[PDB]
Symmetry: C2
Subunit: 518 residues, 2 copies
């Protein structure tokens, strides 16, 4: 009997440690459900309890299902390379291979982050014709295909379109016939229009701010769209275990090792994160949307899967990971920290990429870093070295070296200083997006708005961190996580006149804008 005593003790305390309306969790071992539990409410106002058969959007956990459809109904990604050439018909750089789309090594900038720059409302309707209009206008990459990893939902949204055109069938129908029926996922469905989903309510907020029902109206497929219950997701884990020994089986074909073009090990393959804990290899994926979070993980050597799905923005990924470590008996352990010198604090700029790192004290030998899409906590392990699980930074005087070895990324960043001039106001234009950024002063405080084919955004405050380097936080958007902070790095003439600027974030780097107004 697989002993679930420590798992049960952890699950019993989830509602107090991961505060929110409701959720579901499961642990599958050797193809058997050994732990399955629902708690709380699907809706706090109608008082509808959360159940094991309550469907929820699984969001980015859909990506692995779109690569499974690709392999099952089309074949290897190379069969769609000709069609990708016609889809990205205005491309000016070398196009990524369809295989690079599947592995998140494409170099394309994320279209949900770009939708903010095109003026999208965070709670706006987003149609299939607008997705294609934005994806098919892309011309450039932000790194050479195969050279680095970056998470790009557009890779999978394009894949869905390629699959439907090659096959002459809908992704809705192919998933149902080729994946959900054989796996025993009885109620799983691709529901592309998020405005139609009302079987469970998702909540934005947290225990301090309060919880608010989320409204989502985007339409998506390929990068997300599947809605399924805990029991549906359990059936997928059982299908995985039943087909574990078939070398030509769909999941085994999705989940092998991958590398970058230089042979360095990569962290993602065919819609799956590839990771390890205590020396044991894991494959899985998480998903997010305003109001929702979920995660699945599978350890092939121990025939073990863990699932967590919440109708709020709490740590479902952390829950699923901790259940896996508890079931594997992995002791996750303690780092000795040192005091953070005050010389670390402030912002640091990479000239090559236009990205910025900002550091602040988070107490006890810890720093809060803002660099990627979400902030990360870093342990200060020595006078000049700090690290999170993904990023290491080393300081030498006025330079920081930042490394994210899993992305094949290494940056050299210089301390940003000086007082920022307020002559940056005016209008700027991006030729590739056909979009404008308007910057105005109101009482000495600078605000900006994004104006493009999706609409005109609200005004957002900007914050300077040194001469000509400004941050523009965007906290809510059509997809989740939101982009975080856009980094604006202005460029000037030899006369000191502004000619343009770079706008970027980790999901979409170096978007060039030229000054056209003020």
């Amino acid at each position: 009997k697989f002993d679930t005593s420590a798992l049960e003790a952890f699950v019993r305390h989830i509602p107090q440690n991961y505060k929110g309306p409701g959720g579901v969790v499961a642990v599958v071992k050797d193809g058997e459900v050994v732990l399955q539990h629902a708690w709380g409410f699907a809706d706090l106002r109608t008082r509808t309890p959360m159940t094991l058969d309550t469907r929820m959007p699984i969001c980015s956990v859909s990506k692995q299902f779109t690569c499974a459809v690709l392999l099952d109904a089309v074949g290897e990604p190379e069969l769609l390379d000709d069609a990708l050439e016609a889809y990205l018909d205005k491309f000016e750089d070398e196009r990524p291979a369809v295989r690079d789309l599947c592995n998140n090594q494409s170099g394309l900038r994320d279209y949900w982050a770009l939708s903010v720059l095109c003026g999208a409302d965070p709670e706006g309707v987003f149609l299939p014709a607008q997705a294609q209009s934005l994806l098919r206008r892309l011309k450039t990459t932000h790194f050479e295909p195969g050279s680095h990893y970056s998470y790009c939902n557009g890779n999978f949204r394009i894949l869905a379109d390629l699959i439907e055109a090659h096959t002459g069938r809908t992704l809705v129908d192919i998933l149902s016939e080729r994946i959900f029926a054989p796996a025993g996922m009885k109620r799983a469905e691709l529901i592309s229009d998020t405005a139609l989903f009302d079987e469970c309510t998702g909540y934005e907020g947290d225990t301090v701010r309060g919880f608010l029902p989320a409204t989502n109206r985007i339409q998506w497929m390929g990068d997300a769209g599947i809605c399924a219950s805990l029991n549906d997701m359990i059936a997928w884990e059982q299908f995985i275990d039943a087909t574990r020994d078939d070398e030509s089986g769909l999941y085994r074909r999705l989940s092998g090792p991958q590398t970058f073009k230089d042979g360095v090990a990569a962290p993602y393959g065919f819609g799956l994160n590839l990771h390890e804990t205590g020396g044991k290899r894991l494959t899985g994926h998480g998903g997010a949307l305003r109001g929702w979070r979920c995660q699945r993980w599978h350890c092939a050597d121990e025939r073990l899967s863990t699932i967590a799905m919440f109708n709020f923005e709490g740590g479902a990924s952390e829950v699923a990971f901790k259940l896996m470590n508890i079931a594997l008996g992995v002791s996750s352990s303690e780092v000795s920290r040192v005091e953070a010198d005050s010389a670390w604090f402030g912002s640091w700029l990479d000239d090559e990429t236009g990205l910025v790192l900002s550091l602040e004290d988070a107490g006890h030998g810890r720093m809060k870093a803002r660099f990627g899409t979400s902030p990360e906590m870093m342990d200060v392990v020595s006078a000049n070295e700090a690290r999170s699980a993904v990023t290491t930074i080393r300081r030498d005087g006025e330079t920081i070296e930042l490394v994210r070895a899993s992305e094949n990324l290494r940056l050299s960043m210089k301390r940003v200083k000086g007082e920022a001039k307020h002559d940056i106001i005016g209008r700027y234009h991006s030729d590739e997006l056909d979009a404008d950024l308007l910057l105005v002063s109101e009482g000495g405080a600078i605000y900006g708005a994004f104006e493009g084919f999706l609409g005109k955004s609200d005004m957002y405050p900007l914050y300077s961190v040194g001469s000509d380097v400004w941050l523009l936080p965007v906290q809510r958007s059509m997809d989740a996580p939101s982009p975080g902070e856009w980094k604006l790095v202005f460029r000037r003439d030899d006369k000191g006149e502004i000619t343009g600027l770079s706008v970027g974030c980790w999901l979409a780097r170096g978007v060039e804008y030229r000054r056209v107004q003020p």
Copy 2:
């Protein structure tokens, strides 16, 4: 020339330190405006700039105007004591004097906190007939009148009703004729229905969560309701300075010293907070509602006033206070801290009052305390002593002594321990409010709802901190700050059966409920 160089340098950095859509600030010295500034937007979507003439709700800054009306149009508070007896016609305890209402020493429980227990929706409509129905059903106090201080909006909402009935005139008209016209407050107005106000938009949220437009539909008067611009508020500060030498002048009559019934100095009088900074006496008040914050302070010895009004939930009170200290040249200074022993952490219960203190590490010789309506940061100054600006705590083994000397409050609290039994589910009834609390289990996690004459609330999660002691956070409500955490302390028989419980928070303590169901 009063030198404003340090004030201007501070004001220039407000938008970066106090992040939000917009605001206004002013400094008045010797009756002259020496600093007046607006920044940002009144509405981020319509892009309407914030101006010096943009009106906003001043919320609880209205209380001083209702006591000014009382003194000007009625006379001393003792003239309304007979009418208070008829208004609180079901009172079972000794009624407070009308003077205790004015000084916040009444012992009445706050009606906005009680509206949550009666089932109010946080964004619900609240009419004058519902205010009277809730206020006139009150029967008991939570401390003897004059013995302690507690902030109670009901004191001022009752005062408004008493004034209108004695005078036969509307508070709208009396404020306009007797206060706003003579003070030169040209556009100030009592707009009791918050749903009608649309000249400026208030925003809930913060720079990390994002900002959301607030919807408020409550109707109020006496405790709040005045809407005014920065220029209106400047005219009130100038009127104060012009009448500073008249011993029988309205503001001088509102702003003298007060004491509790035992002669100890009290911190509030006639709708004004009474405080000091660097040895200089201040009088003033702040205001809050979802989406809005403001504060005014005046230092009579230096003929100095400071005002800050924001259309978001940031630190307007901290801004107004810091401007005052900068203008007075008060050096606010540093406390040496010690490491917080782990024995402090957890929850502590006062048996007399039913209130709970919870402590957690906030880093560097600091603790986050949850006791009052909002959390407070405490400096650990010695092994067994910690303090905030308002509260001091001393630990001795399994007991903590908590003192809020400005409230005349001293509690002896014992560490709460043990595992909480889940047999608390069932229905409970408050005879005085005619309201129920329903507690249910959903998958092992307990949730509660408040059901009374205002409606049936949504379900809210509860969190146990030790045997029979639970916390129920309520983060959003009709008034602001919300109550914070309700403290539920269950009572049992000699047989171990639950008979009832105490529900309370600092604004409304010891509301007794009896078990009626499960």
